[PDB]
Amino acid sequence: PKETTIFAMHLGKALDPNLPVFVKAEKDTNIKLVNVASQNQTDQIQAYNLMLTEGKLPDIVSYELSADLENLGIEGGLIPLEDLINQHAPNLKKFFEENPRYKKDAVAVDGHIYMIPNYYDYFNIKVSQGYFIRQDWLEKLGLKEPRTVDELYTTLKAFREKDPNGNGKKDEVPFFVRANNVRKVLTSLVDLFKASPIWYEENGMVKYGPAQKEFKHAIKELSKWYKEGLIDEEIFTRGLESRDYLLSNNLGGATDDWIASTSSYNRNLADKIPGFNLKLVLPYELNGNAKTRHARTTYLGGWGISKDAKDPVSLIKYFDYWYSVEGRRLWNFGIEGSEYTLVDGKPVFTDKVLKNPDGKTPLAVLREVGAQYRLGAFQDAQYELGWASESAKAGYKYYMDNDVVLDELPILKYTKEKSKEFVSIDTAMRAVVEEKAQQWILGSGDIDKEWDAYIKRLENLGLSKAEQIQNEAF
Numbered sequence: 343p344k345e346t347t348i349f350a351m352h353l354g355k356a357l358d359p360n361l362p363v364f365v366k367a368e369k370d371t372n373i374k375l376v377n378v379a380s381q382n383q384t385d386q387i388q389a390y391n392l393m394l395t396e397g398k399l400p401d402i403v404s405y406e407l408s409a410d411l412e413n414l415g416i417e418g419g420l421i422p423l424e425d426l427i428n429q430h431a432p433n434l435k436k437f438f439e440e441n442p443r444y445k446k447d448a449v450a451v452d453g454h455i456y457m458i459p460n461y462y463d464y465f466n467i468k469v470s471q472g473y474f475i476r477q478d479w480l481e482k483l484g485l486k487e488p489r490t491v492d493e494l495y496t497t498l499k500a501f502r503e504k505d506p507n508g509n510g511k512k513d514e515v516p517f518f519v520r521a522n523n524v525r526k527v528l529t530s531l532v533d534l535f536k537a538s539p540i541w542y543e544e545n546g547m548v549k550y551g552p553a554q555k556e557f558k559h560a561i562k563e564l565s566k567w568y569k570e571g572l573i574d575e576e577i578f579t580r581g582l583e584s585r586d587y588l589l590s591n592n593l594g595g596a597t598d599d600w601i602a603s604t605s606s607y608n609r610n611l612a613d614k615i616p617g618f619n620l621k622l623v624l625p626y627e628l629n630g631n632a633k634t635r636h637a638r639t640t641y642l643g644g645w646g647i648s649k650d651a652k653d654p655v656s657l658i659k660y661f662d663y664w665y666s667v668e669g670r671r672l673w674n675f676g677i678e679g680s681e682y683t684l685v686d687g688k689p690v691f692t693d694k695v696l697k698n699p700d701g702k703t704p705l706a707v708l709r710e711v712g713a714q715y716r717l718g719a720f721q722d723a724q725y726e727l728g729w730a731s732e733s734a735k736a737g738y739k740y741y742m743d744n745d746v747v748l749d750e751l752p753i754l755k756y757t758k759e760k761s762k763e764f765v766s767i768d769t770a771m772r773a774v775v776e777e778k779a780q781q782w783i784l785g786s787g788d789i790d791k792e793w794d795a796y797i798k799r800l801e802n803l804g805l806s807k808a809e810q811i812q813n814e815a816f
């Protein structure tokens with residue numbers, strides 16, 4: 343039994359090594375994880391920053407912000423992994439050989455690998471979020487499916503004012519989102535208005551979304567919709583249970599969220615809310631613009647081995663376990679005999695996952711056992727297709743066939759000084775954006791009055807230099 347410290351959080355939860363997935367991994371690898379993040383910590387960014395001041399680094403450092411993680415490597419906090427992989431990680435060695443695009447995500451500008459990313463199965467499923475609306479509420483109110491942002495506005499107003507759930511109460515929450523930080527709230531609100539809360543590419547150039555007039559318009563509109571009760575008054579505080587709560591209580595009318603899990607509610611709530619039909623629609627058009635910037639990335643976050651780890655060989659073997667057939671299946675599907683059984687050598691989920699008696703989504707059930715826990719593993723789309731509804735599967739194709747999805751800007755990588763400065767600027771600007779966007783949407787500040795000063799503040803923090811760094815790396 344090898345006791346191994348780790349910093350690991352995901353979706354606001356510190357990794358619990360007693361979860362079934364990690365107990366099995368412990369048996370198979372003899373690695374016993376001990377988290378340095380405690381169970382009452384839910385802010386991964388603040389926890390990571392605090393962790394950096396605590397002295398000795400944990401053996402394994404997992405983090406969702408890969409640019410920060412790579413900077414830690416460049417500074418010597420994380421060790422290079424490439425020799426460790428070549429000598430002791432045959433599964434990872436093979437994975438990088440077979441997948442050059444994925445290998446590119448793991449290699450820093452200086453040629454070292456400081457982290458193993460958590461890869462999506464991008465070349466099998468590359469869409470992410472889509473727009474959903476309560477078709478049964480449309481039918482009840484005699485309304486057509488809205489196809490433009492103005493029509494959405496009018497439709498949401500009808501949801502708010504005309505009691506579509508039929509209970510005589512003004513309790514409807516027309517548009518809602520699902521998030522565990524301010525960035526994710528903004529992400530699922532501003533795409534409506536063809537804005538972006540992050541960096542994006544435009545004709546060969548890299549631009550900062552929150553500095554654009556499209557973002558100003560998005561926030562100004564959202565402020566109006568907020569005041570009129572068309573978007574959830576609790577958007578910034580409701581947290582990751584928002585969708586579960588608002589749909590299961592027949593309050594929510596529309597959202598922007600991941601296609602498979604959001605599609606699971608029709609079956610999930612069919613008995614509880616007769617006629618419930620939360621239906622995928624193409625992104626609403628804004629003056630003819632039919633595009634969404636919601637796309638799956640090749641990876642999200644990653645983990646590395648710190649300079650303070652006593653036994654890195656043992657740890658790279660732990661990293662490698664997740665790329666074995668059995669280890670990858672474990673990460674993706676949970677435990678054989680519990681979450682799935684093998685049928686002709688292929689995992690098929692059980693009723694526990696597919697027909698959960700407490701209305702948990704299939705993905706929610708899988709996360710509860712430690713499956714899909716973001717570390718540095720490789721997702722398998724067969725897991726997603728294994729619980730996705732027929733409507734979800736048709737939905738992927740709907741979005742792809744209609745060419746509405748714009749690829750995400752890959753995370754750019756820089757040389758050491760530029761990387762340190764970019765992350766510093768990017769982080770400082772993020773704080774300003776998230777402060778002002780809340781103030782403006784909630785009505786405590788006036789965006790028309792304050793926008794120019796906000797832009798000057800971003801510039802003061804280094805927006806132009808960040809723009810230059812981004813475009814050199816592009």
Ligand SMILES: CC(=O)N[C@@H]1[C@@H](O[C@@H]2OC(C(=O)O)=C[C@H](O)[C@H]2O)[C@@H](O)[C@@H](CO)O[C@H]1O
Nearest residue numbers: 460521600601602603604642705714716726
């Ligand atoms: C890597 C990871 O855990 N990503 C999180 C998202 O998970 C995706 O969610 C869905 C879905 O249909 O809901 C399908 C994908 O298979 C799965 O990877 C998602 O939970 C998101 C919510 O904000 O958070 C990501 O970190």
Ligand SMILES: [Ca+2]
Nearest residue numbers: 505509511513
């Ligand atoms: Ca009502």
